[PDB]
Design a protein around this ligand. Structure first.
Ligand SMILES: CCOC(=O)CCNCc1ccccc1
Ligand SMILES: CCOC(=O)CCNCc1ccccc1
Lengths: 237, 300
């Protein structure tokens, strides 16, 4: 059924699985019109489809042209997400296809379940975890490829860089979710933490800086402090 | 006007005939039901006094044969049988009528309730839902499961209603996933009406039969089928106008006849609130919406 804290190690077993987050598929800026009404302008979005064991991220860029002349865009975006995840599964060799797809928002269940009616052995599951994948667009290289796209495009990344050479998937996912939670709670301060020291750089082929094991411990502590700091600023604690 | 005689009544039982119910005491001199209107299917049903477990009964049409009831002390129930000897049958009925041992189908002349509940129900279609080809009448009980219930366990004792499943390959056309799920018109009009049922009369007949089995036997799978067949129409943006108007009449009489005290178990809140207030047909069921709001405002 649903994925929660009780069954958390299941994410790192040898059954292929993907998380799907649709929170950045349909993105808009709201503005006033000349007549003083309100209108939206869409900007490019993306589907965040992640294998939590390997770090492989299938970033499908959703170009604003897909919304042209369409109605009820927030509803359509869920079906377009399911359409594209469906298409991704069909493009993978059988031995690479997931056995489970976990959606981060329960509104994706029926659209995805409908799109995968002819794939009955792939479980479509919700989660009780509050995962910070919306903050993917705070990763500079991901935001850059989305905003520069002029047509639909799929871009492949490893969201863990080379971390799995030194740490387990469980620890890598924990680091990722901590980084993304910090970027979601206070993006300016998180980015300051990650780049404050000009001597630690981001390799051309990486998303995050090239921290040593000890530096990662310092960074992780600073991110926890940020999250707690913001939690106190928010609730006046 | 036709007659279903009873050999005897050896166990105390509540007997119902369509929407009417009466009690018979253990070994009471009771020999059946007369003045049954010709032209409709009927149902004769039973609930034993000492074990209300298992309501059961028989759908029949007196135009198809001479039928009677006899208690079987081995299987412990009142069974319907056919008498092939017409002169024996007529002589039995005449004797029981002369001795005034038969209750009379108490049909008020003004009252169209049974016609309105069975307008599209035909014995031939009942016999394909309930498969027992050697009899002209059909047995149903509280516990019988449907073909769909069994997919999710004796197949010979099953209710073969048409399977409706909104998240299936039958429901959804390749490349029309959003369209077909949010607007079920394809599934209603092409798959079900044109393809399976052939016409709306057969669809309404199965819907009406499902409701009556839900109401008279507490048959849960029949209640599921009735609501699924309602939801499939209400969730379609394109439905022939004559079908919507007829559905409103069908459901009005069903809601009118439903015992008020069974509403909690026989009516699905989600389906009814969706059908009346959110669906494409939310404004097409005026009579049904009015009776539902006046009779069952809590459910809504
Ligand atoms: C390459 C995509 O070709 C398809 O047909 C997509 C199938 N989508 C789920 C489905 C399959 C079959 C019926 C209904 C829904
Ligand atoms: C004053 C209360 O009256 C009742 O409860 C009526 C019960 N059924 C009437 C009936 C009798 C015989 C055959 C069919 C129906």
């Amino acid at each position: 059924g649903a994925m929660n804290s009780s069954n958390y190690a299941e994410l790192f077993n040898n059954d292929i699985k993907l998380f799907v987050d649709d929170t950045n598929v349909y993105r808009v800026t709201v503005h006033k019109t000349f007549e003083g009404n309100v209108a939206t302008k869409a900007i490019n979005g993306c589907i965040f489809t992640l294998n939590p064991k390997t770090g492989h991220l299938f970033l499908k860029i959703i170009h604003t042209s897909v919304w042209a002349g369409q109605k009820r865009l927030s509803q359509l975006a869920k079906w377009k997400t399911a359409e594209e995840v469906s298409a991704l599964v069909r493009s993978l060799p059988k031995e690479e296809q997931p056995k489970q797809i976990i959606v981060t928002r329960k509104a994706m269940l029926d659209p995805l379940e409908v799109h995968m009616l002819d794939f009955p052995n792939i479980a479509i599951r919700p989660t009780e975890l509050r995962l910070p994948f919306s903050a993917a667009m705070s990763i500079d290289k991901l935001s850059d490829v989305v905003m520069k796209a002029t047509e639909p495009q799929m871009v492949l990344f490893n969201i863990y860089d080379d971390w799995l050479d030194r740490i387990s998937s469980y620890t890598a996912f924990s680091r990722l979710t901590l980084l993304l939670r910090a970027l979601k709670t206070n993006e300016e301060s998180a980015k300051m933490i990650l780049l404050s020291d000009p001597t630690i750089t981001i390799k051309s082929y990486h998303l995050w800086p090239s921290f040593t094991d000890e530096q990662w411990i310092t960074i992780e502590s600073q991110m926890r402090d940020l999250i707690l700091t913001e939690y106190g600023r928010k609730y006046n604690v | 006007m036709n007659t279903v005689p009873f050999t005897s009544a050896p166990i105390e039982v509540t007997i119902g005939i369509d929407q009417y119910s009466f009690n018979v005491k253990e070994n009471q001199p009771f020999h059946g039901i007369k003045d049954i209107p010709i032209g409709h299917v009927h149902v004769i049903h039973f609930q034993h006094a000492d074990n209300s477990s298992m309501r059961y009964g028989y759908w029949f049409d007196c135009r198809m044969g001479n039928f009677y009831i006899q208690y079987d002390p081995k299987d412990g129930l009142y069974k319907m049988m056919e008498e092939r000897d017409g002169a024996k049958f007529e002589n039995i009925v005449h004797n029981f009528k002369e001795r005034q041992m038969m209750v009379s189908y108490p049909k008020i002349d003004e009252d169209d309730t049974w016609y309105n509940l069975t307008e599209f129900v035909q014995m031939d279609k009942i016999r394909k839902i309930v498969r027992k080809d050697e009899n002209q009448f059909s047995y149903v009980d509280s516990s019988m499961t449907t073909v769909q219930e069994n997919e999710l366990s004796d197949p010979a004792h099953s209710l073969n209603y048409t399977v409706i499943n909104f998240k299936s390959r039958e429901a959804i056309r390749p490349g029309h996933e959003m369209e077909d799920f949010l607007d079920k018109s394809y599934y209603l009009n092409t798959v079900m009406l044109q393809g399976i049922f052939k016409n709306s009369s057969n669809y309404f007949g199965e819907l009406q039969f499902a409701f009556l089995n839900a109401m008279f036997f507490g048959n849960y799978g029949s209640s599921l089928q009735w609501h699924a067949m309602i939801e499939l129409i209400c969730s379609s943006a394109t439905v022939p106008k004559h079908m919507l108007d007829k559905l409103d009449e069908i459901l009005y009489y069903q809601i009118k006849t439903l015992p008020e005290q069974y509403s909690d178990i026989l009516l699905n809140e989600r389906v009814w609130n969706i059908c009346l207030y959110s669906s494409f047909q939310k404004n097409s069921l005026h009579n049904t919406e009015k009776i539902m709001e006046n009779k069952y405002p809590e459910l809504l």
